[PDB]
Amino acid sequence: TCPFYKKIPGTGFTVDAFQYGVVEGCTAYFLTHFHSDHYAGLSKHFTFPVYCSEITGNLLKNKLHVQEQYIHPLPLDTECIVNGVKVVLLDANHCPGAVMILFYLPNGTVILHTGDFRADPSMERSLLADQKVHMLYLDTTYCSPEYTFPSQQEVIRFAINTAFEAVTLNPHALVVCGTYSIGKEKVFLAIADVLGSKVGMSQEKYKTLQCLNIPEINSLITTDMCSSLVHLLPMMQINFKGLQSHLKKCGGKYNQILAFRPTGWTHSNKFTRIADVIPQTKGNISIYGIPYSEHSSYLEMKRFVQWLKPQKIIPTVNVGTWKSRSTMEKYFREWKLEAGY
Numbered sequence: 001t002c003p004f005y006k007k008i009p010g011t012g013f014t015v016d017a018f019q020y021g022v023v024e025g026c027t028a029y030f031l032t033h034f035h036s037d038h039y040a041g042l043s044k045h046f047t048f049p050v051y052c053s054e055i056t057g058n059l060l061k062n063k064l065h066v067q068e069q070y071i072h073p074l075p076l077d078t079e080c081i082v083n084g085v086k087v088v089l090l091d092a093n094h095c096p097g098a099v100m101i102l103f104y105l106p107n108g109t110v111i112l113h114t115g116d117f118r119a120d121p122s123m124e125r126s127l128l129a130d131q132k133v134h135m136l137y138l139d140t141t142y143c144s145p146e147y148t149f150p151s152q153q154e155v156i157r158f159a160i161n162t163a164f165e166a167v168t169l170n171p172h173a174l175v176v177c178g179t180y181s182i183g184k185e186k187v188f189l190a191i192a193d194v195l196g197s198k199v200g201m202s203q204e205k206y207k208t209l210q211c212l213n214i215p216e217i218n219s220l221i222t223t224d225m226c227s228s229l230v231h232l233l234p235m236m237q238i239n240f241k242g243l244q245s246h247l248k249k250c251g252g253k254y255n256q257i258l259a260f261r262p263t264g265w266t267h268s269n270k271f272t273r274i275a276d277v278i279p280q281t282k283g284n285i286s287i288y289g290i291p292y293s294e295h296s297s298y299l300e301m302k303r304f305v306q307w308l309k310p311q312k313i314i315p316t317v318n319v320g321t322w323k324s325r326s327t328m329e330k331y332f333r334e335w336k337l338e339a340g341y
């Protein structure tokens with residue numbers, strides 16, 4: 001059954017609530033983003049209205065086969081009326097097509113649902129600038145001070161420089177990047193760009209990337225593996241076993257692999273700066289774990305909430321243990337005391 005922190009008081013709306021069968025009283029189901037934890041339950045057999053971004057809508061149609069008549073895309077940054085209620089979709093800085101949803105309730109209440117997000121100072125100049133939020137439904141994935149990691153830009157710099165140096169030293173090296181879901185596309189795109197290559201991949205992954213509205217995409221990606229020196233593979237193949245296997249299929253083209261495994265936060269960020277990171281090596285294979293996060297750091301999340309000044313906060317992640325719940329409530333009170341709201 002659908003939990004409380006996925007319902008929208010005083011509307012017939014839910015958010016990311018597709019795995020609980022028919023929800024009692026729901027006339028419209030919002031989807032924040034095309035990630036399996038959130039879309040879980042949607043298929044060709046779904047027959048209620050689904051409201052989402054255009055990008056999320058292209059994925060629902062082509063990958064999940066949801067019938068066109070039930071897909072309702074909305075533009076960003078635009079006041080829209082749905083079933084008699086004003087709503088706005090805002091860029092969540094998460095994966096392609098991900099949004100936060102602002103709801104203007106009939107009773108004068110204003111609710112912001114962040115879905116999954118990476119808070120950014122640029123959000124302080126969105127349609128949120130105007131106005132008050134009574135309830136904030138917050139992605140608390142990394143709500144503890146120990147969670148630190150670099151900017152996306154620093155991680156991409158590191159990856160571009162590492163791949164360019166290795167390929168310039170050895171024109172016979174192949175670059176491999178691991179993937180599982182959408183998001184983090186900049187890692188393989190930026191590497192392929194610096195090397196003058198298209199990204200090679202499976203037919204299923206090419207199909208997925210074609211739904212994303214990336215300008216110039218036909219020029220950047222291909223299913224012809226033999227013409228590309230940057231290959232995408234499923235994340236679970238990014239190990240010495242998997243990579244050796246892959247290298248045998250390439251027909252004596254390459255004598256080295258350098259591979260990249262994008263992760264979220266790991267404990268090594270406590271101690272090692274991005275510039276100082278080093279790979280795991282076995283023979284002519286090397287594997288770099290890189291901390292490319294699409295969720296807020298603690299510092300990022302704190303800045304956004306202290307700016308927003310919401311009246312109440314309801315966490316949507318780490319809500320399963322008393323200790324987690326308690327710890328989050330303690331941070332929300334410090335932030336409020338420090339900033340004066």
Ligand code: NI
Nearest residue numbers: 033035094116
């Ligand atoms: Ni997500």
